[PDB]
From TrEMBL, chain B:
The keyword Signal appears for this protein: yes
Organism: Eptatretus burgeri
GO CC, any one term: membrane
The entry's keywords: Leucine-rich repeat, Membrane, Receptor, Repeat, Signal, Transmembrane, Transmembrane helix
Location of this chain's protein in the cell: Membrane
Disulphide bridges: C212-C245, C214-C257
Entire protein: shown range: 141 to 231 of 305
Protein name: Variable lymphocyte receptor B
């Protein structure tokens, strides 16, 4: 169904959000960082807000951003000790998510090679930078999901 | 007025918005009530749906949220076809909630503080083509739990704490095409468990800590090798090797017994 599928996506996102919240807790319990990277962000032009809403361009953006987050999600593996099953679950449930959004759609991936070296570049940095990268992934992937969640609720 | 018919505060706002009314004190016609066939009220603050029984033609229902416990009034919506039910805090399904809802095609039941499914609970739902019991925290399934569900084509049991499966659990599901068991605690499955699933197109087994000690792993290991196409990863792609042994991290299907 349409209501079934839409509930099922709503639910999958909420589960990822809970997870992110766990990693958040664990990380700024070390960094206190909760108040360059070019991380995927929603802008009014993407069609996802209530002023300027557009199903088709919103949905393309959701799926493109999520696909861009993936390498940042890979970065996240083994930077967590008490909340690692979740670190893994977040990575894996994003994939399931992207798969649900694709069945929903009609009509652009990232290159693995940039991603292989962007990833060694982030992993190469000092411990403060490493944690600063983490807090920003978590923060921006979260805002991204929330924005995706509100819009899907209106599609 | 609406607030009289639907005594719950949030449920009255749902209906008000559903009908394009200006306040919860507006009167409603027999026409307005007769013609609601879809109610969308997941992640709401509803505690009770009392009043819903005055809405005989609801076919599509999404219902759920932190505060919900009182769903007794669902029982006589004999037209309900698509139901998504998410009572976050609920601990016990009312005796035979689903018994009179025999036109149900699609049932999503996400009730994570429930922990045990009462036996018989799905026995009247013979028209179900799709059952989703993800996100509960199920340690086990009761015997015979899916037996009357002859028509299921999609069954999703992922994100639970299943440690084992009942012998024969899927034996009556010959139309099943899609079966999800990922993100549980399966150490193993019983010999034969998939043998009757001759329509299976997609199965997901990854993110279980499988026990690969021989001879126990035999059946599963050989099963995965002999349906290398059905076995899928989180991105929906073919990945026989996604099923992995705990500790070691080897592919289950890389284990060969004497």
């Amino acid at each position: 169904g349409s209501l079934t599928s839409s509930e099922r996506i709503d639910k999958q996102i909420r589960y990822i959000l809970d997870g992110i919240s766990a990693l958040r807790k664990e990380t700024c319990n070390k960094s206190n960082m909760c108040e360059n990277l070019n991380l995927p962000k929603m802008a009014e032009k993407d069609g996802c807000f209530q002023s300027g809403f557009n199903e088709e361009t919103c949905l393309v953006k959701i799926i493109t951003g999520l696909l861009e987050f993936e390498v940042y999600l890979e970065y996240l593996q083994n930077r967590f000790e008490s909340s690692e099953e979740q670190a893994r679950a977040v990575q894996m449930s994003t994939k399931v998510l992207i798969q649900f959004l694709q069945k929903k759609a009609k009509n652009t991936t990232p290159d693995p090679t940039t991603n292989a070296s962007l990833l060694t570049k982030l992993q190469a940095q000092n411990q403060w930078l490493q944690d600063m990268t983490t807090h920003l992934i978590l923060r921006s992937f979260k805002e991204f999901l929330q924005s995706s969640l509100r819009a899907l609720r209106q599609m | 007025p609406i607030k009289q018919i639907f005594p719950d505060d949030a449920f009255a706002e749902t209906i008000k918005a559903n009908l394009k009314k200006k306040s919860v004190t507006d009167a409603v016609t027999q026409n307005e009530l007769n013609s609601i066939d879809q109610i969308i009220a997941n992640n709401s603050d509803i505690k009770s749906v009392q009043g819903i029984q005055y809405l005989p033609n609801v076919r599509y229902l999404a219902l759920g949220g932190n505060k919900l416990h009182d769903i007794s009034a669902l029982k006589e919506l004999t037209n309900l076809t698509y139901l998504t039910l998410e009572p976050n805090q609920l601990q016990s399904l009312p005796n035979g909630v689903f018994d009179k809802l025999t036109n149900l095609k699609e049932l999503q039941l996400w009730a994570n503080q429930l922990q045990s499914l009462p036996d018989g609970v799905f026995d009247k739902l013979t028209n179900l083509t799709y059952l989703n019991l993800a996100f509960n925290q199920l340690q086990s399934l009761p015997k015979g739990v899916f037996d009357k569900l002859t028509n299921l084509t999609e069954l999703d049991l992922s994100y639970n704490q299943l440690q084992s499966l009942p012998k024969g659990v899927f034996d009556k599901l010959t139309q099943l095409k899609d079966l999800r068991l990922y993100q549980n605690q399966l150490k193993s499955v019983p010999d034969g468990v998939f043998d009757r699933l001759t329509s299976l197109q997609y199965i997901w087994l990854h993110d279980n800590p499988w026990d690969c000690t021989c001879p126990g792993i035999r059946y599963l290991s050989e099963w995965i090798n002999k349906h290398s196409g059905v076995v899928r990863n989180s991105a929906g792609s073919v990945a026989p090797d996604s099923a992995k042994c705990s500790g070691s991290g080897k592919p289950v299907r890389s284990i060969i017994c004497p």
